[PDB]
């Protein structure tokens, strides 16, 4: 009667994709929740600041891409950017 939402459904789907015989504890599924929320807040705050620096009013894919390039180190940013651009490109083709 106090419905509260999380990310565990999608974390579990991803797990069944990468390791389709492995489970997860109940504390690891809390740690992954905290991790997703932390990274979300980081990326979103940096994109907000980026749009404020350039006198814009909207947050677009370009702000998210620049925020990802600012926050992730080294080869993490290259792969994350490729993932994002592939996803957006596939989405617009509909």
């Amino acid at each position: 009667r106090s419905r509260k939402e999380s990310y565990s459904v999608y974390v579990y789907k991803v797990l069944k994709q990468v390791h389709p015989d492995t489970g997860i504890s109940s504390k690891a599924m809390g740690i992954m929740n905290s991790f997703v929320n932390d990274i979300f807040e980081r990326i979103a705050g940096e994109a907000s600041r980026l749009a404020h620096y350039n006198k814009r009013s909207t947050i677009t894919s370009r702000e998210i891409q620049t925020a990802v390039r600012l926050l992730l180190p080294g080869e993490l940013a290259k792969h994350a950017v490729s993932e994002g651009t592939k996803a957006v490109t596939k989405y617009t083709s509909s």
């Binding site: 990468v18 390791h19 080294g74 080869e75 993490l76």
Partner: protein
Amino acid sequence: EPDKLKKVLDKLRLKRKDISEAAETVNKVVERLLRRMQKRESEFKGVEQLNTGSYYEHVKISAPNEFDVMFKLEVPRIELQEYYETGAFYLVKFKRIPRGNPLSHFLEGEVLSATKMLSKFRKIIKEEVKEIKDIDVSVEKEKPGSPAVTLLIRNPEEISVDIILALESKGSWPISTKEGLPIQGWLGTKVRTNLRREPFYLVPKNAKDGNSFQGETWRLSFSHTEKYILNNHGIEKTCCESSGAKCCRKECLKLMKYLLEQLKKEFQELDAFCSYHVKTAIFHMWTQDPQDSQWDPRNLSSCFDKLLAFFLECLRTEKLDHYFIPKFNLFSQELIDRKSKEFLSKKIEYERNNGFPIFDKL
């Protein structure tokens, strides 16, 4: 008449007598080769030969002048791409690898170029066996149609050894295998978990080339798991030991493999049939087999005929499942023409009705 079969099995044991000396000499040169490949500086630093045994039950072998060994190579984070949606051939890519991939020169863009890496393998192996000439050993280069580098040794006379590169991955036994290795109700679930925590292998083989990227396709290999299960072939893992009861599983396996070997070579039209078909069928027969009493050498001939019945029933309904990948069932007409499978059936009729005359050789 299991005595005639038993003495032909003894005959196989006399190939074995010739082949302990032949196999030891080849093994020794390859072993020296192995130690030499691990010291030289190249992308092949840690390359073991993967041991699946030496026995006929364990290795590729035919007429005494041809041997096979498996060389394994551990590979970094690998991502597979299904190319034959049957589920038998793959493209290989990498993942992030933050430190560095010491193989990027072997890739065409994002896909691993098997051809280039194999070319480097061939070059390095030929040069290295060329750099030490104790035993008269040379390299032969045949058509680039099946990627195997065959050494010819003149000691005592022609010894051929096809060297097959195999990549080793430790990751997860990909999803195409998810309901492979079904033994849970036969041996147990604890073994299956343990077996499936082992690594798996990818071997270069160009799936017939209705495709652009050639060589760049790979097939799955589970040679180590297969050797383990076969050498603990029984519901009682005590099989083939003094601690347990000798059964007729291995005898039937040798009987069908060699019978087929002789019949297929004497009628060369049917060469699309490979030794893996017999292993897959016997895997299915041993897993559905609930009874240890269904395998005992005094009933060798009856179990073997039952196996023949199993073989015809597998043939009949147009599918023979890959024991590790049920989604890839190799008994598709597109790789074996229907008439040829039935022609083999006719040959089976031929063998079955004639009282194994092809065995009346010596």
